Design a protein around this nucleic acid. Structure first.
Lengths: 242, 243, 243, 242, 243, 243
DNA sequence: TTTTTTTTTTTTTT
DNA sequence: TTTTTTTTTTTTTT
């Protein structure tokens, strides 16, 4: 009777039926498309220049705009106050239709990752610090929003190399900005940062082709997707990392 | 007096089959698969199978807290989950023998659940890609706790151990990701929390030994005589040196 | 010159028999085995032996908390445990002396408990396989604290020490598994929790020296003259170098 | 002016003046003389036999007489109840004029330490367990009341040998019976047990001559106070102990 | 073919000067050195320089909590600290920007602070002797976070990196001593707390590149062309292998 | 503008003596010895010296909690302590600059305190015998925190370090015994709590360098030129390898 | 960031 | 003895 669970198992699996359901029940959190829609809406023609300012502001000062405003120059405070009021900026994790410095940096990952080369020594974990862990550490990987640039169709060994090279940074960064991860083990830090990382790697924002074009442009992969010597070095550094 | 009674009681031959029936009957039981199927049929009627398939995808990719997952979901999804909560009177955690949870549905219907893992691989808390980094071509059919429900316990001990150590490589990763209070603990400490539910499913009376080995053969996990595949052997070893 | 012979007499001359009578009279007695068997016969009647066998399997593979174990068990098992709780008025932990617990049943009937361990080996908190990893072909009859009640204290000291060190290898593992705080403590700290109950049963008045040695002989633990087996000798050494 | 603390320092120290003061301000805790006075008072002619019973009772069952009574034989419970009522026994640490099983064992250290040879395998830390740490561990040292048998006039190296040999046991025992010391470091256990140990070693109860006569009788020292091979072995085992 | 050149342009072509203006404009500014000196002159009058010297000694050897330090100090000292608190309206921690703290005084007057370190060396939380154990003849002028304000950012990159790594060896020690939770954390975790304030002062508009290099030359940290000294080179290497 | 003022302020030569006066004046101060003596003389009158001797024995062998020690003391002792509490208005712990404690009395009169240690050696929390086990013939005059008050800081650095490392061997033991919350901490962690009060007493203005070296010479701790004794040298080394 | 004499003998399958 | 998407960037001599 009840061991008819065999008949239920016997039915061949439908890739499209299951893919409709996984799509319907999917975690709906960060919408990069909505963020860009809101920036364009509040900023108008100035949205790009203000977004670049907000990327610098997020990467070097954090996600609390009213707090950072208090320990800043006269000119800076005036710019941040204008941005808070134009873009109706918030702190932390508000509703889906609300903008934060984090969300701006995350939706515009292509622009954020390019800025890291210049901003490297102004970050919580500097390029110099990373170079101590792995020589000539890839600066374009030094932000959680880099996960949105990873082509998931890349050969598994090449893909794992990029993510292990990026995880070397995440391990340092997470232990430093997440109060719950201060001094915790590698395995613990990776268990808290892999699920949001892998969601960004397998998101529908930016096609595989565009993602690999960015990795090629940043000099992270070659013509066939083979990671650079620096990525390979970093990927190994993560395997023996503490 | 009572010493003579203790000797005469011990003088009686050990009944291997009587004790083996009892150890089975009193064994740990995480859920009654038969009661779960009985409840799905009762609440769902003729739609119970299609709704069970939905709940398998829902459990595997979103978890066991239906009202919580509903908060970070689309309008359509939110409506499907709300309808399922109300039809099947779904609960979170470990409720009574007469209550349904997304976990229990996936666990009672292990044969289908394990088959879905091939498609759902990159949407799981621990992806197939991640597992391949630990052990090459990691068996996707093993990437769910309900896989223990498909293991034939009559398999030769060495073959049986290799299947379970392979599966344990996944369990070790999965437990650290889905359970935050197991993240800083050792391999031995994490294994201590997942071996009892695993071994219960392996030694349960739900789905016979013959049918269970037929599944392992079909999933390509064992050969004609029950010898595990190279991938299973590789993962069992990866688990022995795992941290 | 008299004070010298006085400190000499008060230090060297000890009334070994007077002290040995007292230590036995004051020894921890959570229960009297004779009273336990008297209570089983009283509540169970003609079925007391079959129910006692069930309670031994239940105590060895599930523990001493009958209402707790009942919740993660099959429909049939739960119904058997509930029936046993109500017939024998079973309790958890350490109640009064006219009270029965699964532990006390297994302890009073040590002769059958120890015989069941051969069949139940892979269902115990510490399996026979796990023990074999510490000492080859570990004696299964020693894999329960109630084994101490089977030990003949009149055995030659060296033979008696081999039996107890061999049994202590198991106790060391068992205590760490059934008491998680002990996992990070020393052999000496873990030993401190199990040596007093062990030595009390070894020197108890329940079952004579002659019968106790006839059990050790029957279990194949000692020879005709009380010389321990190769497996016992191996286990006794494994304990000396154990951590 | 105020640097006249030099004139205060300049006064030569008086050994007898200081010894009167240390005597007057001394810690007044356990009075072995009062304990024996109370045993004789309540027990009469039976005080010695009842004291021997109470030593066995303390060493193998503890210091809680009403508690131990509940998990004991009919005969034993009857004896313990009679002892509780004759000697007005208490649990824990009551007033100076109150008897406890601990205080009885401690005041009659000579009798207690002799009983350890027979009681060895009934103790929280057995002789067998100790033999695993140091071969043929001295059974007479396996009780805190042994500190009352130590001659403090012994040559420093011989004296330290006896106390290091005894401390090997105290380390095991303290970690086991003191809930606050469960799994703590050697240095921590020794910091909590050295002050009460050293007080018993330097107490006025039992003269130096009698103390050394006991150590000689127990076979712990030779004619000149040189410790035995077992004590020497144990003293070393404590130096490398964890 | 245009989308290719578009991803190429949006990845490689970065407006280095636009971004560098912004990072400087938004940089953490707990205080403006010019405002600190303006406030010292305003409250202190003609005595502002002598009182500032006192506050530098007070900040370097006692900390940033003036009312706290006052309690474990001599009669004369306590009276001096109380007078300074009331004249300069001193605060603890990180107050508003028109507020003075011992730290802000030492930071705005980096040129004298760093010069005082030669005399104050054995009175600091991390002594010169301690530093000499990590790197021989460690540069005493680098033994304060305010040293970063003395660093010329126009220096050749390799020379600039030697100065900062040499200074970071001190910062690593100092942070562990003045923040006890950091003692059990990694170089990278400890570095994360001191690199942002360091790099902000290195790239601040207070004191020109030309003057900053004239300080490094005067302190004997660099030569005529900006090449660091043997001690700086030694300290830069000690930091690379530091734990 | 303010940049030019910062350069001209730094252009002024470093006044070594002005800074050295200030670092002394602002240095940590556990107690004012002068105020303690002033208070003893005020409350005690002509009996202040004899009562101070009593309080030194009381602090050294019983501690700093006078009402607490009174509970485990003789009738006579109890009366002496109660009389001293009421005459000198004695307090426990670390009260105001104008309050007396047994510790402060012993600390302000270090010359006498250190001389008493020879007689009181076997009555201290850490005995002379215990210390001799760590380092042969350990200097008894060093067996009190107030010994730091006798150290000449003008001594050659290597000689000065050997005296303090020797003394630190005792401090390490003493702190673990008198302070229960320092028992599980490392050498570095315990040293972190006792170096600041030690170094304050070493660099205090109470009792000149000349008088302090005269004491070290008298106690046999240094020779004619300040070279420490073999016992001091031995203890300094014992501290380097201490746990 | 301090300040001087341990505590006190049977558990029980997460 | 459990059950699926981190948190969010300046401290300050015990």
């Amino acid at each position: 009777y009840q061991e008819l669970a065999i008949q239920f198992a016997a039915q061949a699996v439908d890739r499209n039926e299951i893919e409709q359901w996984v799509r319907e029940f999917a975690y709906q959190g960060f919408d990069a498309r909505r963020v860009i829609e809101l920036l364009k809406q509040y900023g108008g023609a100035d949205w790009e220049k203000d977004a670049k300012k907000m990327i610098v502001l997020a990467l070097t000062r954090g996600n609390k705009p009213r707090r950072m405003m208090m320990k800043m120059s006269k000119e800076g405070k005036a710019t941040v106050e204008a941005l808070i009021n134009k873009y109706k900026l918030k702190e932390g994790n508000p509703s889906r239709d609300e903008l934060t410095l984090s969300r701006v940096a995350a939706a515009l990952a292509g622009r954020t990752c390019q800025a890291l080369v210049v901003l490297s020594e102004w970050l919580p974990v500097t390029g110099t610090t990373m170079d101590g862990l792995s020589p000539a550490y890839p600066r374009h990987m030094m932000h959680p929003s880099f996960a949105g640039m990873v082509d998931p169709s890349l050969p598994g060994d090449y893909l794992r190399a990029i993510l292990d090279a990026h995880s070397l940074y995440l391990l340092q960064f997470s232990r430093v900005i997440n109060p719950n991860l201060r001094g915790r083990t590698k395995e613990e830090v990776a268990a808290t940062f892999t699920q949001p990382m892998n969601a960004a790697v397998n998101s529908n924002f930016i096609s595989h082709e565009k993602r690999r074009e960015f990795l090629k442009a940043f000099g992270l992969v070659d013509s066939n997707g083979k990671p650079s010597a620096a990525v390979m070095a970093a990927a190994q550094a993560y395997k023996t990392a503490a």
